[PDB]
């Protein structure tokens, strides 16, 4: 209704800084919504596809009293360079699932609890 761009938010500023991705002109980024009915909190699971390495980042949508909106960074999950088929993130057990089809045309998919410590590991399926 205002027909104007209120703010421009950089997803990498709420994450510890990654310089290459924000200036990268890559394409194929993905957004997923997860609403907590009992929390009234909406989570943006954003897969930023970087040719270096794509990454999942979990944000919470925040709308301040002055119609200014921001992303609260919960966690970021890096991914290796593959053709991502699908990905999901649940708030019931607070999990990331990701399904890729590698360049060799092989179906791979894995899960990880993205609040189970923060320094790098994945549970395969």
């Amino acid at each position: 209704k205002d027909q104007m761009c209120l703010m421009v938010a950089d997803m990498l500023e709420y994450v510890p800084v990654s310089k290459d991705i924000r200036q990268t002109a890559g394409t194929g980024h993905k957004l997923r919504l997860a609403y907590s009915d009992t929390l009234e909190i909406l989570y943006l699971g954003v897969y930023l596809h970087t040719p270096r390495q794509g990454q999942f980042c979990v944000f919470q949508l925040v709308c301040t009293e002055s119609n200014r909106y921001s992303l609260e960074h919960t966690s970021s999950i890096f991914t290796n360079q593959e053709t991502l088929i699908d990905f999901t993130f649940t708030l019931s057990s607070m999990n990331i699932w990701a399904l890729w089809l590698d360049d060799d045309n092989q179906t791979v998919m894995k899960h990880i609890n993205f609040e189970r410590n923060q320094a790098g590991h994945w549970n395969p399926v």
Partner: protein, 602 residues
């Protein structure tokens, strides 16, 4: 008994392309240098960093476990200079000290999903860090901490480029001093040691600060090495000019300060060694003086004097009341002590570790057994020696066994070049094979795996003398590079010869001379088979002795497989060998039955 050089088992499992790009992109920017080292503990990781980038790979493969881009409040590349394991609230992770031109960054890193879990900006410049206690406030029965440290919850001893030592509280007991990735707190550094520690910690917490105590230390000198000997409750601090100062942190004071030979040669590494049995309560500390640009390099065996050897409830034996630290055995590596180059050599320590192997028997009804004093305790030093003129580093992996050295009763003769790996007190492996791949690759660390370092099992306890030789030590290890990892095996020569002979078992007889010679040289044969050579024996009697030994080893499978191999392909003496072994088998049956009757009649 003689050894063989490192055996390659798959060369240069290189790092991923993303890892190579990430490490080598920042080497051009100002205030950035590539660093790499293995992480030891419950982790199995190798870290490499150039400024903001941090790559964590598998320590035995090289595959990128995780990768991250992160900086401090300044864009100057924070180079990871220190990495130490840290367990807080049963969370296992890493404390990482990154150095900047404007300060430093302390990061906590919990193994899970590839970010940083804590970040703090440090006003000083980190050169080395070390966790003193994981739970300082829960530490009240083992006496290694000071009154101020017991008021802390996690104490980090950091050495700066001004010669001072700062003890920082991570403030994991306080939620108002716990920082986020983009949030941080300064340090309320108190040069003095106060008695109002809870009040000052509260003040720092309210002012958004960690409580830090900077000990009165020499200013102008630079700490070249930092280490924590929890066995002696001591903080080993070495300055770039060879001054070694040892601090009693139960008083937070310098219980000792001496000059170890060298005025421009820093104390490059310190390694703690405990003899298998010491009633004098004195252990040993190897201090290595190594030039970083060429010059005199000396290995010093510093004897440490402690009056008290207390047993305190921390699962440790704690040494207290230090009197002196004096070098008692010097070995010049700049010249020729284990190398063939006599002129001054530029020696750099790729790795310095201490490995202790505990052997505890179970084998009873349901229950649990506990570790004891180690039957094998060694200090492993991996070093590169540069002879100027081409700048090519030759790598050697020396192993000093404190237990074998005590069993050799304090050897003190300076060895001079050539091959002397047969010595039990000190040996070394020529890493020339690995060098042939890593001619230019900058070896950042070398990890000898504890699970890899192990000895064989005997057919009848106690173990033979072969167990007490380094030739029995079979161990795989990994060298970190700027391009990947290179993995090698050590003392696999014996099994290589054995399996080559067995696969040649269809014509085993002709290879028995050379194969038996190789087994004897490697020490694979029992100590009794070393006295007879294959040159003075024939293949048939050598085989008969081997078959006998396989019988006492309770290994019928080797005989069965060998005879099945002999059944194929032309080999005329196989029939004679089987005949002789069959009469030998029957006479062995007769002697065994007679001996059994003698045992059973009583």
């Amino acid at each position: 008994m003689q050894n063989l050089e490192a055996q390659v088992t798959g060369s240069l499992v290189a790092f991923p392309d993303v890892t190579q790009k990430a490490l080598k992109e920042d080497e051009i920017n100002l205030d950035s240098v590539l660093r790499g080292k293995f992480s030891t503990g419950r982790t199995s990781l190798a870290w490499l960093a150039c400024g903001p980038q941090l790559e964590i790979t598998n320590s035995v493969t090289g595959e990128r476990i995780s990768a991250y881009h992160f900086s401090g409040l300044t864009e100057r590349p924070p180079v990871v200079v220190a990495v130490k394991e840290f367990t807080w609230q049963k969370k296992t992770g890493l404390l990482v000290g990154l150095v900047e031109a404007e300060g430093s960054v302390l990061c906590l890193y919990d193994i899970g999903i590839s970010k940083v879990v804590k970040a703090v900006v440090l006003p000083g410049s980190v050169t080395a860090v070390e966790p003193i206690i994981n739970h300082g406030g829960a530490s009240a029965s083992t006496q290694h901490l000071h009154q101020s440290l017991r008021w802390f919850f996690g104490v980090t001893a950091v050495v700066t480029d001004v010669g001072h030592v700062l003890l920082i509280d991570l403030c994991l007991d306080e939620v108002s001093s716990n920082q986020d990735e983009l949030d941080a707190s300064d340090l309320e550094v108190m040069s003095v040691i106060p008695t109002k520690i809870p009040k000052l910690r509260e003040a720092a917490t309210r002012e958004r600060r960690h409580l830090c105590l900077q000990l009165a230390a020499p200013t102008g000198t630079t700490v070249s090495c930092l280490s924590y000997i929890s066995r002696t409750n001591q903080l080993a601090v070495g300055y770039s000019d060879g001054y070694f100062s040892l601090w009693n942190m139960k008083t937070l004071r310098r219980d000792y300060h001496v000059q170890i030979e060298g005025g421009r040669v820093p104390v490059c590494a310190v390694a703690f060694q405990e003899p298998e049995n010491d009633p004098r309560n004195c252990c040993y500390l190897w201090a290595v003086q190594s030039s970083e640009s060429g010059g005199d390099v000396s290995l010093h065996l510093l004897q440490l004097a402690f009056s008290d050897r207390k047993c305190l409830a921390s699962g440790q034996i704690m040494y207290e009341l230090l009197e002196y630290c004096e070098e008692r055995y010097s070995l010049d590596l700049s010249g020729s002590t284990l190398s063939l180059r006599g002129q001054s050599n530029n020696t750099k320590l790729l790795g310095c570790q201490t490995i202790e192997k505990f052997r505890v028997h179970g084998e009873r009804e349901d229950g649990v057994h506990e570790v004891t004093s180690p039957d094998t305790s060694v200090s492993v030093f991996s070093w590169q020696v540069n002879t100027y003129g081409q700048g090519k580093p030759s790598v050697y992996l020396g192993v000093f066994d404190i237990n074998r050295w005590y069993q050799a009763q304090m050897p003190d003769s300076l060895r001079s070049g050539q091959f002397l790996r047969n010595c039990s007190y000190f040996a070394f492996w020529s890493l020339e094979a690995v060098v042939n791949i890593t001619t230019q690759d900058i070896i950042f660390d070398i990890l000898v795996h504890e699970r890899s370092l192990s000895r064989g099992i005997p057919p009848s306890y106690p173990p033979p003398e072969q167990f007490y030789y380094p030739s029995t030590y079979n161990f795989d290890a990994t060298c970190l590079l700027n391009s990947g990892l290179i993995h090698f095996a050590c003392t696999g020569f014996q099994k290589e010869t054995l399996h080559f002979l067995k696969k040649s078992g269809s014509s085993l007889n002709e290879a028995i001379p050379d194969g038996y010679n190789r087994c004897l040289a490697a020490g694979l044969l029992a100590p009794k088979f070393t006295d007879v050579q294959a040159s003075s024996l024939s293949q048939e009697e050598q085989l008969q002795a081997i078959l006998a030994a396989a019988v006492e080893t309770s290994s019928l499978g080797l005989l069965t497989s060998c005879i099945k191999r002999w059944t194929a392909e032309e080999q005329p003496r196989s029939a004679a060998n089987l005949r002789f072994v069959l009469e030998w088998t029957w006479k062995k049956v007769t002697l065994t039955k007679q001996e059994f009757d003698r045992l059973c009649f009583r």
